[PDB]
Ligand binder design. Sequence first.
Ligand code: NAG
Ligand code: NAG
Ligand code: GLU
Ligand code: GLU
Lengths: 514, 512
Amino acid sequence: FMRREIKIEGDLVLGGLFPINEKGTGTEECGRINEDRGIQRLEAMLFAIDEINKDNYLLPGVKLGVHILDTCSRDTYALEQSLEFVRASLIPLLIAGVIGGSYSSVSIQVANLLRLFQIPQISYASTSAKLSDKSRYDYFARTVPPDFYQAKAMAEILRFFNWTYVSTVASEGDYGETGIEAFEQEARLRNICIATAEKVGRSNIRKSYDSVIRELLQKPNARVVVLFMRSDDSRELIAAANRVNASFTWVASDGWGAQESIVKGSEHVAYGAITLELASHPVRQFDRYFQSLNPYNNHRNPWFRDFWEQKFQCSLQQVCDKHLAIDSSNYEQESKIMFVVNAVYAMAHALHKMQRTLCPQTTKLCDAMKILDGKKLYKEYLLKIQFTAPFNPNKGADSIVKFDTFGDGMGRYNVFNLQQTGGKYSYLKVGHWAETLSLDVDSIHWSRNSVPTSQCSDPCAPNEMKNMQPGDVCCWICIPCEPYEYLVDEFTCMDCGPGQWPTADLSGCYNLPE
Amino acid sequence: RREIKIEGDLVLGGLFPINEKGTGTEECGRINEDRGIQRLEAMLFAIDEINKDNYLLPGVKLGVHILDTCSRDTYALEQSLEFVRASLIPLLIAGVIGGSYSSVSIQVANLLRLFQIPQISYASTSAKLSDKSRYDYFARTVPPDFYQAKAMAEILRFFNWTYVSTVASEGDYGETGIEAFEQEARLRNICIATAEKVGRSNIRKSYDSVIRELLQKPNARVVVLFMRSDDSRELIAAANRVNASFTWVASDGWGAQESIVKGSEHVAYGAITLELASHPVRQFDRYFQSLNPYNNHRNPWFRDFWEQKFQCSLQQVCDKHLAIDSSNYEQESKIMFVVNAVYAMAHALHKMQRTLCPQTTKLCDAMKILDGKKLYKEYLLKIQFTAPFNPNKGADSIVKFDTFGDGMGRYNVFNLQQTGGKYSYLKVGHWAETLSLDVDSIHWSRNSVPTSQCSDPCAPNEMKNMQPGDVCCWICIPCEPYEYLVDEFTCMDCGPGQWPTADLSGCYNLPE
Ligand SMILES: *[C@@H]1O[C@H](CO)[C@@H](O)[C@H](O)[C@H]1NC(C)=O
Ligand SMILES: *[C@@H]1O[C@H](CO)[C@@H](O)[C@H](O)[C@H]1NC(C)=O
Ligand SMILES: N[C@@H](CCC(=O)O)C(=O)O
Ligand SMILES: N[C@@H](CCC(=O)O)C(=O)O
């Protein structure tokens, strides 16, 4: 009966799309609140707009409004909601540009719609490589990189610890499939074999997941499982492994990232997991803003109440303590917030340079810009380069926001390790990827305190077996050697020669008596 | 804000260029009588018949939501939003019938695929639409211009017109259509004197400027046209002003439309045009001619249509006895395709209803929310005998689709004549896989089979043919009096004691 949205008027309006709510189960379209990647990212856009509307050097004279909608983590729903943005170009607010899409599937479908009406779009989290194709997504840009690189970071980590036999499980969609396709290619090149390639997807219940765990279990040697899955899917997969108490060493992409909500209730099954996330740094000023929010002062966000009640397990009108508050003990800035803020700022800077150009006499939205030329805006937005919203210290660690010729951001990632040292589970940065892998292996805590072994065949017996490679470079057979042969090396048996005999160790030959 | 909204258990959207493109600031202009109104009524006709048919969708009444595209892709696209807001007063759309201009069908297709809504065009011929990776919910009852271009090039190659000029409409129809021609041209050693093109928001001047430029290539007397209907009309009028005269070879955009040459009949005389191979739907003639402002209130565009066709007014008032009849009406060439497009959609839904609703003829719950993807990949396999409105079944009168969702590449060639004081299009041939036409029935511009070559033919008595750098133009070199033409391009000394024959084909001995 009621479909929520945020509508704030302005001289120029920016549309927004966030997975405020998780996907609905069964017949319902929306489910529980997505606390970190939903509410936080939403308020980070509101935070950016407020800051911009108080900035005298950026769009002074032009107030930015917004029209933020919920995607409910589903491309189809996001798509239906976005129709709201195009009808406006005919109560309805004219959309200068759209900020959003977290899931690549929604960003892509939304992009297919938006280009039809020349509406620029900037995503702050969609990493699918498909989105780099300017012949299909010509009005799309993003402040994050294409998984073309993330897939390399993952394959190079496996190649490092010599994990040549692994299983993979990808989410159906443009994120999981294209991302896993990239990995497979990077794997072949580095002689890494895939034991079993699984995949879950749309409208999947426990059984589809339990069925995946079972199939992973049918490849016991492949103890390292490469994941390229959506957040929600990852959560389901780990819950499935927790039931049958299965245990593997997970290598997950940003979809999983450094989210604690993913492993909650199955912390021991995900212990030792290694995950990736886009290299970013918290926006300090945002921490202050978000923590100051509460059901009393934050009425413009129609999802905040539901949020509040779920985060604290509340109720208003077990009632809730009017003294609750978001703080350093219960809140941690979502990993990609920086990208949301930069996205909004990039659109503002683009509009700002356009207004300086077409309206040389005032700071106001002059007649020449009453009807925006979206095509020009995009080909004015692509060439944008600016120092990251003030909320970023220094400027030496290349803190400039700009875009590739494909409209992408820079491929930089951080590697994380799920630890628990202090009784509580948390992610610890254990490395990073810029162009080459980098990580200090010593700070890594593994599953079962031993650096995993993930190879095709069982190791050869010492006392007499030689390692033999068939046709591939992942599997082998062990050939016991003749009692008179020793192991010159791991794969070769050689006759000790007359008068000599192999040592018990088989490392050499000793002289025979008698 | 006009439209046709008729409720039903299942609804089909429709798009037709009811109105011409608006000039300047206006979005819509005059009524498009044949390609707009007739085609629109043909869908209404088809829907009525299907609703009286006990063997096709019995128990499931088909309704419609028909909109005007005003011959513009952007306008059609905005209108089409109506079709998708529905899947959220608004009628849910099972499928869309339409797009005449390829540019509107393309843009509409990019929107419809996003909501898995199948679309069947009855006239959009662009080869682009065959790409199923881009237009995966699009199908059509007509073939791609990949073939039409071949038909045109082979016609030129036949009469040896190796030097021609081309003018194409800007847009997905003219540009891709002309590109295909150019390729087919090179392969048959046909050169393009000058490639012209008109387009969006073009006034007289742009066209006048094209005629001048065509005139700057006098040898190229044959001009190939791959233009929209409206653009063609503009180009012909322009030629009429400066009384220019060429032999036109136009694609179906022009087709067999008399409205294109009205007021410039003498300028287009002898023109050769193409149109998809089709036959009139007889039962449709009865239906259309029975329509009048008194009995046709469901078509909100009919009154304007009536007033323009008869130069009327209601409330020079109009004779209450006017009628659409055999002396002022002729079935539009593509009506058949419109009717078959609707029936194809109907047959697809019917098969789906038999499959998901095995126990009743009604739209059961299982089909409450249609799976458009399945529908499209259940419509592509459809094969049926053309709506009853087609005699025989031997002349392959079955409707079905390519793997690309296209129809069969069959065209007819027409010649604009005037023999009986009045101007008309006579069928002078056709193209199925190879060209075919009886050259004797063709009337040319200036009673002489046109000559369109780069250079003038060489004198016999002594000139040899010499090719410069290209393969279309040449110069003529007279031979020395003692040389003969071993062949068309080579003079050769008859040698001592000999001399060339009067005809220069050989050498004879000298006396004395
Ligand atoms: C990977 O294998 C190579 C070759 O056997 C070995 O030198 C290297 O130490 C291994 N890396 C690790 C840390 O397992
Ligand atoms: C040139 O065209 C004429 C007319 O159809 C035809 O009779 C003749 O054979 C053609 N000659 C060539 C070059 O093939
Ligand atoms: N990179 C993921 C989104 C992850 C996120 O929302 O943080 C995608 O492209 O679907
Ligand atoms: N074949 C033309 C349409 C001609 C017609 O409407 O009959 C096109 O694709 O633009």
